[PDB]
């Protein structure tokens, strides 16, 4: 009921500040349900987008740069991969290897077998998603999730 308590709320108890809980220094809140399933499905590198749909997704994004990225496939016809459009969503340039522990591959001995990229493991560099698939371990309430690093 005053500017004084409104000031105090805005600074201390406002939600965006409540992201990473001091109980166990991790995200209190992450990408959940359908969206979380929809992110996995979108980041698989067999996903391709034609000019018309990419523009609509670009359109729903807020802080979009204004420049339209060059499609990962130039010919025969322009196509952007899913990783590519996810990569506009990552703010500034945060970095994290791993932070997947997905079922995928061959725990304990597969990455040591040629690093045949296997695509499973997720790598992001300078604010661009290089490879891998996003899941609850990348996006969830995890200690090293994309969301924690972003905060």
């Amino acid at each position: 009921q005053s500017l004084e308590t409104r000031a105090e709320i805005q600074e201390l108890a406002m939600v965006p500040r409540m992201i990473v809980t001091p109980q166990s220094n991790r995200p209190v809140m992450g990408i959940v349900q359908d969206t979380l399933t929809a992110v996995r499905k979108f980041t698989k590198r067999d996903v391709f987008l034609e000019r018309g749909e990419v523009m609509n997704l670009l359109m729903f994004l807020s802080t979009w740069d204004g420049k339209v990225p060059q499609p990962a496939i130039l010919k025969p016809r322009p196509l952007w991969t899913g990783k590519q459009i996810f990569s506009l969503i990552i703010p500034g340039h945060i970095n994290c290897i791993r932070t997947h522990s997905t079922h995928p591959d061959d725990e304990d001995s597969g990455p040591y077998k040629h690093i045949s990229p296997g695509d499973t493991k997720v790598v992001v560099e300078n604010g661009e998603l290089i490879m891998g698939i996003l899941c609850k371990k990348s996006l969830g309430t995890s200690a090293g999730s994309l969301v924690h690093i972003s905060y």
Binding site: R45, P71, A72, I73, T81, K83, Q84, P117, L129, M131
Partner: peptide, 11 residues
């Protein structure tokens, strides 16, 4: 050399 074409990998 390792290269990445939008998620599609090359070696």
């Amino acid at each position: 050399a390792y290269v990445s074409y939008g998620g599609l990998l090359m070696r």
